[PDB]
Symmetry: C2
């Protein structure tokens, strides 16, 4: 019993803020589509305007250009009306699509508007959903454009733009308060009769806003003349309406029909279903009319009828009073004085006004993966960055040179080209340069060829740019902790490699002195990213970009576009500049680009060019949700980037500032950031007086606006700096170098000092102090605001007129689980492709440990995770295990001592290890076995629960309490005990298989055959469980406990036979034959006691066994038939690997030997382990190099295998009772890793979130060697001479 | 998401109840077959008789997974067991995979 009203407003309401809000919406597809389609319809309708009106309309690519003009008041009536309509429709659509609002209905809602909202009113009352509304909304946008154009045409015909307009559009109406409409009408009539005005230029009453207020419209000049006649206590206010409306003496039905002639005729037009309140018209309620008919009615009201704005409330209430309702819940959109609408409407109703409920939280969460924003215009996260800079070999040394304010410029080293012949102060010879200084990389020719599968002769002929790109890409990939095919986003086919280069000096001067097979592939620029795509086996795009001194940023843009379009999920964006061709420097000097004195003196009054600086940089990029889901180290984010050209310049080379300011404003508008949000600006700052002044002016105008009073608008300081004063100009890596500086500054929360200003500031710059912007001459703290972010603006310009710029944001707040890894022992793994690299890795790792000895407890788990699950393991390997970090340090130190002493490292065999999985019987099953695994592994728990459900399905005791309580082992029945043993063995085998364990053969012992059979593939899990359970059921139902027993004797069979009285088979039974000197006999209590006494009489050790029933004796005879029948039920199948069966003393490789006869013989026969193992050894299946794994509660069978095979065969245990489960697991995995196995490390850490974090471990220890081709004989200064 | 989880759980139980064939070569076997020409209750009786005669674990017996029409139904079981049971059905009974 509470009606709602959707009330829209006229042009009085300022809708620029709503337009900006709608433009910023990202998480609504329908709103984005409407905002993308409205501008096209608007432009199409604008193209159909008159000649006069099209010269007073601006050019706009997007609606982001009409907001500043709408605020400045320089928008003509047509575009303003269209923008108002667009804002209203967009607000309604966003409310009713993203806001999850129920669409208005003809029983609980009504619509209303005033002079521009009457169009949207019919557009909304015609549809029934947002999808059904968008096309009507576009039609309404066109109609609004036409209406505004018609009113503008009539107005411009009625009067001329006064000489003192200068862009703005004068108001055609004003609100007058303090006099009733019936008396202001008389005032107008008297003024008309006196002034003797034409009937078309007379002022008119354009609205009745209330009982003592109204709105009067007329042309600017006449309006001013009439308003000057109005005296106190009457008040006058100037409204922003720029054309005549509501003038029955200026418009006729012809105009109304012309306005609505953009709607093609049809019989498919919707009617209006939601009633519309038309208070101005004679009838308030409007329902049933078609869409174009009601649209023409709305246009007629907006052009010919006066606003009866004093009767809206009384109308709406009346409607509510017709349906029996008692209250109104106003829902105004872009309405003026909306706050009074509700009280005004409810004043006429009996009452019952009540508040409204809450938003109901987020109103259901989004499914994982659906919480993001579309890939179109999403933040681009930066994961890692590596680089080589002057007098540096890392980002840390780069920060060292920055924060200390060093000038790295120096003369040209003799490795590139001479200086006594290639340079002169007054160049008189050809190709000679006036300058010789530059910031160089003195280790450019230092490469680890063998690591990258490169020959010693192929390497000297590769451009140092390619080598350094490979090095930095590998380092950045390591730092990001991304392995190919590791996850969905790192698949080898979802990784493109963009780069920026501008020269091939190596081809031109270095490798062209002797052309060879690698000339083209070594020198060509496409091979720069080609090598990175090839070595890492990335099968995505591979581009090189050449925009001169903006390439690296331009290339960056390319990558982001791909990330935004979905071509790739990960990008490797780089930038390289290595200088080896003297003629390039000579031509940059002859063109007056290079400072003849020193480095780049940015902002200095004596700035006279720049200095060339070599540099290589590589960065790893992904979309933000991709990096968050993969748990990657996020350094920063890119919010936007754009490019344009300085076409309006006065020459090809020199820049232009208007385009730069336009670019900055465009990126700020697209990112939605005001001028205050940015805190730093890494300017291009090449060190040119004109360029520096122009760039500074553009930047300060964009980010440091000056108020009309001459004050500053920034409430916080702004800093500007240039990297090129420290390291110089890269000309292809300048953008990446600047980005690296920004990343380092975000890391260290500091703003380095500025070193460019040597003598005095530049007098051409604006007054920075007045604008609240500074050039830090000494390092300044740059703390991260609490609960906030630091935002930066980066620019990069080229001598060809290209300008690129981007906006950087702080990475999100990291929120680690902060959970404690319950494990005790942890592994640290190191690898290398060379023994020297192994030594280097060990040394650097111990150094890192020394630096990080006392950080916290999570350091060791996180280091283990980073070294195992986030690395690529080469041939040469090393491992360490420990419960704390100091044990790791000591172990690795001893390994390093062994390596240095002379113990050369040997690569692990290419194939790796072969594993024999021994399964144990029901002898050593103790209380609480597997509980640790059951609690600390989710897969183990799921397997146990699955087995429990299966067993309970086929009428078997539950095996779940045996892994939860540990108090049930006391009462465990033999059937329950055997079911638990088999389930544990199967689950443990599956757990080990998921870690990368692959069995070359399986051998069981009297109960491990079943699980060994499953591991071989003969049986399924359910078949094994059913068979074991049914055998135990038969044994328990038929046999009786205590009648029989078994005795273990450590002596040869011949001696046992000789000593015992009676023949074997009758006096006793050889139950098990485990070894040459181990045997187990079985028999009744009397026979067992007699045999024990006789054997002890001969001084031979004997032990008893605690088996309640009998196995491998005659007591299992009365159950063999039934068991056979059960064995027929199963579905036997061929095994994938040999089954070493002790029952037959053989090694089965076919299903022909797995009939029910087998499953009765195994129960009744003896365990001829010795014969089976001997046969396996003879066949070559088992030898010393094989590794044994015990799938059971104790390493008993592995002992038999060790005895049979030899004496130097490694063996390992899964669990135990006197040791720690994870200690054994770590020893096993460490030895497997050292053997050469490929462990599924990622699954090891799956259930331990606390260790999921990539640390900044040292870099790979490259075995760098010098491959360099030397420019000789100064031939580049004789390009054209003969041999004179 | 719910559909993915349901499919995964059904796949887990099925793979626990049987193993992929040796000659599958990637393709996935069929656990169901439509049987026509026999009423649902008579086909249930046939299933019960086959189970009683044969030796089968209670978690591997074929079951009547759907009663489509008065003379059509759908019976499900593991590939091998389904193949074994289907051949026991003689004309004019129709089998569709």
């Amino acid at each position: 019993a509470q009606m709602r009203v959707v009330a829209f407003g006229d042009q009085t309401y300022d809708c620029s803020e709503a337009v900006s809000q709608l433009l910023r919406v990202r998480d609504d597809a329908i709103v984005v589509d409407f905002l993308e389609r409205a501008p096209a319809v608007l432009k199409a309708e604008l193209a159909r305007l008159s000649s006069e009106q099209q010269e007073e309309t601006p050019r706009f690519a997007t609606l982001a250009e009409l907001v500043p003009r709408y605020r400045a008041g320089t928008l003509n009536p047509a575009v303003s009306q269209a923008l108002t309509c667009i804002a209203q429709l967009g607000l309604f659509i966003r409310q009713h699509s993203s806001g999850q609002e129920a669409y208005p209905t003809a029983h609980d809602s009504c619509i209303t508007g005033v002079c521009t909202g009457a169009l949207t009113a019919v557009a909304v009352g015609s549809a029934s959903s947002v999808t059904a509304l968008v096309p009507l909304a576009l039609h309404t946008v066109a109609v609004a454009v036409r209406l505004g154009a018609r009113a503008w045409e009539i107005g411009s015909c009625l009067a001329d733009a006064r000489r003192g307009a200068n862009g703005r559009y004068a108001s055609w109406t004003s609100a007058v308060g303090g006099i009733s409409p019936q008396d202001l009408q008389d005032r107008i009539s008297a003024y008309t009769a006196e002034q003797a005005l034409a009937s078309v230029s007379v002022p008119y009453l354009s609205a009745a806003v209330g009982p003592g207020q109204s709105s009067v419209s007329a042309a600017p000049v006449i309006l001013d003349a009439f308003l000057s006649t109005l005296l106190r206590p009457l008040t006058t206010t100037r409204l922003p309406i720029t054309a005549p409306y509501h003038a029955p003496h200026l418009f006729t039905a012809k105009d109304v029909q012309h306005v609505t002639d953009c709607l093609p005729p049809s019989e498919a037009w919707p009617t209006v279903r939601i009633p519309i309140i038309s208070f101005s018209r004679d009838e308030a309620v409007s329902r049933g009319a078609s869409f174009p008919a009601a649209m023409s009615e709305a246009v007629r009201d907006c052009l010919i009828r006066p606003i009866a704005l004093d009767r809206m409330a009384v109308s709406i209430a009346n409607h509510a009073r017709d349906l029996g309702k008692d209250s109104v819940l106003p829902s105004p959109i872009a309405l003026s004085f909306s706050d009074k609408l509700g009280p005004q409407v409810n004043s006429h109703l009996p009452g019952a006004k009540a508040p409204t409920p809450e938003l109901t939280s987020k109103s259901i969460p989004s499914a994982i993966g659906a919480e993001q924003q579309p890939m179109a215009k999403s933040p681009i996260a930066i994961l890692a960055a590596s680089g080589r800079f002057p007098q540096s070999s890392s980002m840390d040394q780069f920060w060292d040179v920055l924060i200390n304010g060093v000038d790295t410029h120096e003369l040209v080293p003799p490795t590139r080209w001479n200086a006594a012949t290639h340079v002169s102060e007054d160049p008189k010879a050809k190709n000679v340069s006036g300058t010789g200084f530059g910031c160089w990389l003195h280790e450019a020719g230092e490469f680890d060829a063998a690591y990258f599968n490169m020959s010693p002769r192929e390497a000297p002929q590769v451009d140092p740019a390619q080598r350094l790109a490979l090095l930095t890409a590998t380092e950045a990939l390591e730092q990001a902790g991304v392995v190919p095919n590791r996850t969905s986003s790192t698949q080898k086919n979802r990784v493109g490699v963009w780069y920026g280069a501008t020269s091939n000096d190596w081809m031109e001067t270095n490798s062209a002195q002797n052309v060879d097979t690698y000339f083209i592939p070594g020198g060509n620029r496409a091979f720069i990213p080609g090598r990175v795509n090839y070595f890492h086996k990335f099968s995505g795009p591979s581009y090189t970009i050449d925009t001169a001194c903006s390439s690296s940023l331009a290339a960056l843009h390319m990558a982001c576009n791909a990330l935004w379009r979905g071509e790739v999920d990960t990008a490797i964006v780089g930038g390289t500049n290595v200088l080896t061709n003297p003629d390039m420097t000579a031509g940059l000097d002859a063109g007056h680009f290079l400072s003849r004195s020193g480095n780049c003196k940015t902002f200095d009054d004596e700035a006279d060019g720049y200095c060339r600086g070599e540099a290589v940089v590589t960065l790893i990029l992904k979309r933000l949700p991709d990096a968050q889901a993969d748990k990657d180290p996020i350094q920063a984010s890119i919010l936007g980037i754009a490019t344009n050209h300085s076409a309006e310049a006065a020459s090809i080379t020199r820049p232009h500032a208007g385009a730069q300011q336009d670019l900055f404003q465009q990126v700020l508008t697209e990112t939605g950031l005001t001028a205050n949000d940015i805190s730093v600006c890494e300017m291009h700052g090449t060190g040119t007086q004109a360029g520096d002044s122009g760039e500074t002016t553009s930047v300060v105008e964009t980010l440091a606006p000056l108020n009309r009073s001459g004050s500053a608008v920034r409430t916080t300081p702004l800093y500007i700096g240039a990297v090129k004063s420290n390291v110089g100009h890269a000309e292809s890596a300048a953008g990446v170098s600047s980005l690296a500086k920004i990343l380092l500054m975000l890391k260290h929360s500091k703003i380095p000092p500025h070193v460019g200003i040597k003598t005095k500031l530049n007098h051409r710059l604006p007054d920075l102090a007045a604008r609240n912007t500074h050039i830090a001459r000494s390092e300044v703290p740059w703390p991260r605001p609490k609960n906030g972010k630091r935002r930066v603006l980066l620019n990069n310009f080229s001598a060809a007129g290209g300008n690129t710029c981007l906006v950087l944001e702080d990475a999100p707040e990291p929120e680690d689980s902060q959970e404690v890894d319950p494990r005790e022992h942890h592994i640290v793994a190191l690898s290398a492709k060379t023994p020297d690299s192994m030594v280097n890795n060990l040394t650097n790792m111990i150094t890192w440990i020394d630096k990080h000895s006392g950080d916290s407890l999570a350091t060791l788990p996180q280091l283990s995770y980073t070294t195992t699950a986030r690395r690529v393991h080469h041939r040469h390997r090393a491992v360490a295990t420990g419960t704390d970090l100091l044990q790791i340090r000591s172990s690795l130190q001893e390994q390093l001592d062994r390596r240095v002493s002379g113990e050369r490292s040997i690569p692990h065999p290419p194939n790796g290890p072969s594993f024999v999985l021994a399964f144990t019987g029901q002898g050593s099953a103790f209380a609480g076995m597997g509980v640790d695994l059951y609690k600390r592994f989710a897969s183990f728990r799921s397997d146990i629960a699955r087995y429990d459900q299966i067993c309970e399905g086929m009428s078997l005791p539950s095996i779940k309490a045996m892994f939860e309580d540990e108090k049930v082992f006391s009462t465990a029945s033999p059937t329950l005990q055997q079911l638990t043993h088999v389930c544990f063995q199967m689950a443990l085998y599956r757990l080990w298989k998921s870690l990368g364990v692959q069995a070359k053969a399986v051998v069981g012992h009297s109960l491990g055959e079943y699980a060994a059979l499953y591991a071989a593939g003969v049986l399924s899990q359910s078949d094994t469980l059913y068979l074991v359970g049914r055998r135990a059921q038969l044994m328990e139902k038929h046999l009786s406990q205590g009648t029989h027993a078994m005795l273990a004797v450590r002596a040869k069979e011949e001696a046992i036979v000789a000593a015992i009285d009676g023949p074997p088979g009758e006096a006793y039974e050889f139950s098990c034959r485990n070894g040459e000197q181990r045997n187990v006999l079985g028999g009744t209590v009397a026979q067992i006691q007699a045999a024990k006494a006789a054997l002890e009489a001969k001084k031979i050790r004997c032990q008893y066994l605690d088996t309640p029933m009998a196995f491998h004796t005659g007591q299992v005879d009365p159950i063999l038939p039934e068991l056979l029948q059960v064995a027929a039920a199963c579905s036997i199948q061929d095994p994938q690997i040999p089954v070493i069966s002790p029952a037959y003393g053989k090694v089965i490789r076919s299903a022909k030997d797995f009939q029910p006869e087998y499953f009765t013989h195994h129960c009744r026969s003896s365990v001829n382990m010795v014969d089976a193992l001997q046969s396996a050894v003879e066949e070559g299946l088992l030898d010393k190099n094989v590794i044994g794994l015990e799938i059971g509660p104790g390493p008993v069978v592995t002992q038999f295998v060790k005895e049979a095979v030899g004496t130097t065969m490694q063996t390992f245990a899964s669990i135990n009772k006197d040791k720690d489960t994870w200690q054994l697991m770590t020893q096993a995995l460490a030895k497997f890793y050292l053997a050469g196995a490929s462990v599924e490390w990622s699954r090891y850490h799956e259930d331990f979130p606390g260790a999921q974090k990539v640390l900044e471990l040292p870099a790979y220890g490259w075995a760098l060697k010098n491959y360099w081709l030397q420019y000789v004989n100064d031939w580049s200064l004789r390009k054209g001479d003969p041999a004179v």
